[PDB]
Amino acid sequence: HKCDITLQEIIKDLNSLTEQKTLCTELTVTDIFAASKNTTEKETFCRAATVLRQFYSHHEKDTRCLGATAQQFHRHKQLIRDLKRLDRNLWGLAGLNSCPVKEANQSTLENFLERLKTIMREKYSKCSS
């Protein structure tokens, strides 16, 4: 389970998401990586899945995000779809819903996603030769 191809599905989701730089991706999430470092891998996935679910739930219909042009609206729908896909995969890996996130620091979604990508690539690296 630990080195399951779900890791690749998550990295794929993150690669697409981290191309986005919009008003929406500058909006913030609670910075789960501002912690002093005290949770299991399962708990880390639960934390990340929780904040991203908060984000897409709150911003799927947000006027700052929805877009004026066809291209902007398309990119917004893609962002929400990919956030849901990534979230689905993170929950699968977490196997837990109970992981209260306490951090004060807010980071942009953009920076949060780049950090998660780093962590996920590290896990992948630790799984392969």
Author numbering: 1 to 129
The paper states:
To determine whether the stabilizing effects of the two single mutations T13D and F82D might act in a cooperative manner, we generated the IL-4 double variant T13D-F82D, which we expected to bind IL-4Rα with a KD in the sub-picomolar range. However, interaction analysis revealed that the apparent KD of the complex between IL-4Rα and this IL-4 variant is higher than that observed for the individual single mutation variants T13D and F82D and is similar to that for wild-type IL-4. In addition, the kinetic rate constants, especially the dissociation rate, clearly reflect the binding characteristics of wild-type IL-4. The structures of the IL-4 variants T13D (max. resolution 1.65 Å), F82D (max. resolution 1.7Å) and T13D-F82D (max. resolution 1.8Å) were refined on the basis of the structure of wild-type IL-4 (max. resolution 1.8Å); all crystals were obtained under identical conditions, allowing detailed comparison. In the case of the double variant, T13D-F82D, the side chain of Arg85 also occupies a different side chain conformation from that in wild-type IL-4. Although two "acceptor" carboxylate groups are present, Asp13 and Asp82, the side chain of Arg85 exhibits only one defined side chain conformation in which the guanidinium group is hydrogen bonded to the carboxylate group of Asp82. As in variant F82D, the temperature factors of the side chain atoms of Arg85 are elevated compared to main chain atoms. The fixation of the side chain of Arg85 to the core structure of IL-4 might therefore be not as strong as observed for T13D. Although only a single defined side chain conformation for Arg85 is observed in T13D-F82D, the loss in affinity of the double variant compared to both super-agonists might result from a competition between two possible side chain conformations of Arg85. Since the additional interaction is mediated in both super-agonists by the same indirect mechanism via Arg85, this also explains why combination of two super-agonistic mutations did not lead to a further increase in binding affinity.
Interleukin 4 (IL-4) is a pleiotropic cytokine that plays a major regulatory role in the immune system. Signal transduction of IL-4 is mediated by a sequential binding process, initiated first by binding of IL-4 to its high-affinity single membrane spanning receptor chain IL-4Rα. This intermediate ligand receptor complex then recruits one of two possible low-affinity receptor subunits, the common gamma chain (γc) or the IL-13Rα1 chain, into the functional hetero-trimeric complex to initiate signalling. The overall structure of IL-4 comprises the known four-helical bundle in up-up-down-down topology, which like the crystal packing is unaffected by these mutations.
